[PDB]
Write an enzyme that holds these catalytic residues in place. Sequence first.
Site, PDB file in Angstrom:
ATOM      1  CE1 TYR A   1     -11.889  -3.535  -0.674  1.00  0.00           C
ATOM      2  CE2 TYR A   1      -9.507  -3.199  -0.784  1.00  0.00           C
ATOM      3  CZ  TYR A   1     -10.728  -3.434  -1.419  1.00  0.00           C
ATOM      4  OH  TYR A   1     -10.810  -3.510  -2.793  1.00  0.00           O
TER       5      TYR A   1
ATOM      6  CD1 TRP B   1      -2.161  -2.340   1.366  1.00  0.00           C
ATOM      7  CD2 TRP B   1      -3.439  -0.895   0.240  1.00  0.00           C
ATOM      8  NE1 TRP B   1      -3.306  -2.994   0.993  1.00  0.00           N
ATOM      9  CE2 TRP B   1      -4.105  -2.132   0.286  1.00  0.00           C
ATOM     10  CE3 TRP B   1      -4.066   0.181  -0.393  1.00  0.00           C
ATOM     11  CZ2 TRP B   1      -5.393  -2.330  -0.293  1.00  0.00           C
ATOM     12  CZ3 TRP B   1      -5.350  -0.013  -0.958  1.00  0.00           C
ATOM     13  CH2 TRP B   1      -5.973  -1.267  -0.921  1.00  0.00           C
TER      14      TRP B   1
END
Lengths: 316, 316
Positions: free
Chosen positions: A146, A82
């Site tokens: 998420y 990420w």
Amino acid sequence: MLEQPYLDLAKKVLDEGHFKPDRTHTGTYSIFGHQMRFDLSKGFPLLTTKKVPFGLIKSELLWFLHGDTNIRFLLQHRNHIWDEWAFEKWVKSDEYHGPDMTDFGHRSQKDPEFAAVYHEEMAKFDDRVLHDDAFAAKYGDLGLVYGSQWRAWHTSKGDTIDQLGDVIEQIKTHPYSRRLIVSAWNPEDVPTMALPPCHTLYQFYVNDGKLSLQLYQRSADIFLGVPFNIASYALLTHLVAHECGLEVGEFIHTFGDAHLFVNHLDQIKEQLSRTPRPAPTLQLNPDKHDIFDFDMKDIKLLNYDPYPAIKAPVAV
Amino acid sequence: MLEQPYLDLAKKVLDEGHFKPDRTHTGTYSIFGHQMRFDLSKGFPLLTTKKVPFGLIKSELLWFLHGDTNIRFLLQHRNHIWDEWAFEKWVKSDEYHGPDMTDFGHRSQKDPEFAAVYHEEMAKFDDRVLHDDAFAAKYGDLGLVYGSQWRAWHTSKGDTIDQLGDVIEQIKTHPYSRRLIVSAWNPEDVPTMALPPCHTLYQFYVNDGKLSLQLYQRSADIFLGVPFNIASYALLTHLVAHECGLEVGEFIHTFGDAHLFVNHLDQIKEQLSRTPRPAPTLQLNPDKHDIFDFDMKDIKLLNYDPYPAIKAPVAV
Ligand SMILES: O=c1ccn([C@H]2C[C@H](O)[C@@H](COP(=O)(O)O)O2)c(=O)[nH]1
Ligand SMILES: O=c1ccn([C@H]2C[C@H](O)[C@@H](COP(=O)(O)O)O2)c(=O)[nH]1
């Protein structure tokens, strides 16, 4: 063998997929609407025909499960999946004074000397996120990812729904419910997000003491992404089943657009010449029951014996 | 033949489905995770092996497309599909002074004389909705139903997103987009709604000038609901393609829980002994292009020649 639906999908895109350009300049072969299933009682669907790093998939899932949206936790388990989304932000901000980094995605593949002024800024960005709390709070936090979609969905009245924790409660008390759904798709955020969620929605189902899960994935990179995706939701089905005292059913993987980047052809064709081995086994801590408090050591993978890794370029 | 995936699905639930009780007392045979596809260039998938009233499906879709949430428009086209949800409200309110109507759903099937004091209150409820504006505004308006979810999704900052109208714009200008998604699932409403949407989300896809659409349906009544569902999204794919100047691809129907009520066995088994006929053709007004302003007369069905209707009880 357990991973066959995955190799069948690759074969299918190869001789049946349509050439379509996309969001970059890197072409795709593409199909729309596909469904595959894995019987998780038969073993854990981590591909044996190519080495996939489970330690990455397992620390990214725990991150999501803790409701965390801060890169910092990833970096502590040496998980860089990420970094680019965080870095993008840092770089396009007032506090940034450095080489201009515009379109750094493309320009890391077309310049071997730039690619080292990029890998330089990135190692410094990560080090700061790791050591400077205010910095972490400012640039380490992705916001909409998420962990907040699942665990802290923002309401129009300013509170925060734990979508996943509520559904776990519904599974314990109404197993036969047809509404065991977690959505990651927020119509109000989606036009301004850099990456609207690829994993759009999922649904649980119980029957005869067995938990199944179906994922609707809108967009899937078949060579690079999908092997991670499969293992990630197969593990989720395992953690939830363990929390609810159920056995494990099937993981059902539904696709919208499933594509193969055209710079991945040779790699996928090489992979299709390999012969699947017996699947690994997943083992969960028998003594710990709150999955929200699971840690790296609470999930072991047994008997994973894969073919070598296959190197591919990321699509720009 | 064009409807075969539908008969294959029925056959499948019959010899493969699990007995599961549900939200009522009426048992089901049930599967989880299923996908079927209809090539819409081959004709329009209205079942030929049982008569399905298209006029109902077409006025319900227009209602959704106009963003309307008021039963009144349905009643004007003699479409009663949504009456019970409106009536429920009227009946459980201060202004209601009449027979007690509690659990009227069950109690219309266990009492033939009650069933006529219910059909009495209902005809009076509908007549009022049709003639009394303040009444219509108060009890005719469902609030959260597909017309507002698609066309007027409420944001946390008090405005209103036209999800579907934006996506139509994305199809015209970015056909290859992997994000052509309309969701009906709002995690903040879902715990307090009487019926969380069965038709959870859908995704469009373009390739070679052809529009395809995939529906994720969380819960499906195979005998009664699914024949309507199929035609409703097949028609949507047609209206959108017409608006965007595209030809029509496939309609892809994905299921979560697909069930057969146990009081529908004999009816489905009778249906499976019939032989599909050639499919009808759909014809859209060549001169009108804004689907948001389509009316009943802008959609014709040609060559629809079905077997007789099969009567079944609704599940309580
Ligand atoms: O876990 C992941 C994350 C990303 N992708 C890929 C699929 C697409 O190639 C890209 C998303 O781009 P859009 O689909 O939004 O255009 O990310 C995956 O397959 N799996
Ligand atoms: O257009 C429709 C509307 C409703 N249903 C059915 C499926 C289920 O039997 C019921 C919903 O109940 P839950 O799934 O929410 O429990 O509605 C359909 O199949 N199609």
